[PDB]
Design a protein around this ligand. Structure first.
Ligand SMILES: NCC[C@H](N)C(=O)O
Ligand SMILES: NCC[C@H](N)C(=O)O
Ligand SMILES: NCC[C@H](N)C(=O)O
Ligand SMILES: NCC[C@H](N)C(=O)O
Ligand code: NA
Ligand code: NA
Ligand code: NA
Ligand code: NA
Ligand code: NA
Ligand code: NA
Lengths: 161, 161
């Protein structure tokens, strides 16, 4: 009964509202999410239940390295936690029609983000694929006048050779 | 004496600070700008003068249509207006090493954004290339509880056939 689809530009505001409700994430402009649905919809997903958006994932193929999928934001409505929605979304991005397969997933996961860490490391373990965690963007790179955790880099792959 | 370069992830915060100072633009997270410099640096530019970032442009090749360059944000520090910095940045994105040439520029320009409109329409006129303005994202697509102008779609091209 949760249904999955690609976003469209018109979903921008309802996606933004979901991100704003997901305090673990850094909120971008509404326009950013319109853009994601207009231009990056092949590498993003929405989950919907009873009208409402209950999940979103944003991602893109890296312009330099088209076999690398960068996963930007994973959001699941607080009402719909622990139902497999994030894993269904990620599986959706990985089983699709693209020219190039996904050889690597890259993403950053702050230490507090337990659910996201278990999503990615659990996917890697299920598939028997290596995962590496390295310094990504440290807290010290963030603006003065704002508090932020480290964003360590997770690299999942190679999925194939 | 203004110098132009591709951004890097480490420029994220100083770029964010510039956007935040550019009230015509919608401010994204600092993390967004780190990402732009890490993954999209081939289609972004920074202008620097006496240490300070005085200009930035963000853009990407459309994943579906790699000959289309989408120009996302154009920012010029208030101290450095009317010196050709935006035009130098855009020229930079258009004269480079990519696999595919830029057949179309797409961008949105709200009515209040006079400088940006003259940038794009003036570039098109200089090059003798058509420009079209159509409904892009209307004010009505934006969130309740927030005020926003229309974002009409500008399509500049074809630059070649
Ligand atoms: N993976 C999330 C990275 C960042 N904290 C964001 O919200 O964009
Ligand atoms: N980011 C992963 C967490 C989410 N509750 C889910 O499991 O669907
Ligand atoms: N061209 C700018 C589009 C939008 N107002 C932004 O700031 O992202
Ligand atoms: N967005 C264009 C305006 C900027 N002052 C410039 O001309 O450099
Ligand atoms: Na924006
Ligand atoms: Na869930
Ligand atoms: Na899940
Ligand atoms: Na972000
Ligand atoms: Na200028
Ligand atoms: Na200019």
């Amino acid at each position: 009964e949760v249904v999955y689809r690609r976003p469209e530009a018109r979903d921008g505001t309802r996606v933004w509202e979901l991100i704003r409700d997901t305090g673990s994430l850094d909120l971008n402009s509404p326009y950013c999410y319109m853009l994601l649905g207009d231009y990056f919809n092949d590498t993003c997903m929405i989950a919907e239940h009873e009208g409402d958006i209950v999940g979103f994932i944003s991602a893109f193929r890296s312009p330099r390295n088209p076999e690398t999928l960068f996963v930007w934001q994973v959001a699941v409505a607080s009402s719909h936690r622990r139902q497999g929605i994030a894993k269904a979304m990620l599986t959706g991005l990985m089983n699709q029609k693209a020219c190039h397969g996904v050889r690597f997933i890259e993403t950053t996961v702050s230490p507090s983000n337990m659910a996201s860490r278990r999503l990615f490391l659990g996917y890697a373990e299920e598939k028997s694929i290596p995962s590496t965690v390295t310094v990504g963007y440290g807290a010290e790179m963030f603006p003065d006048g704002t508090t932020h955790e480290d964003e360590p880099l997770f690299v999942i792959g190679p999925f194939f050779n």
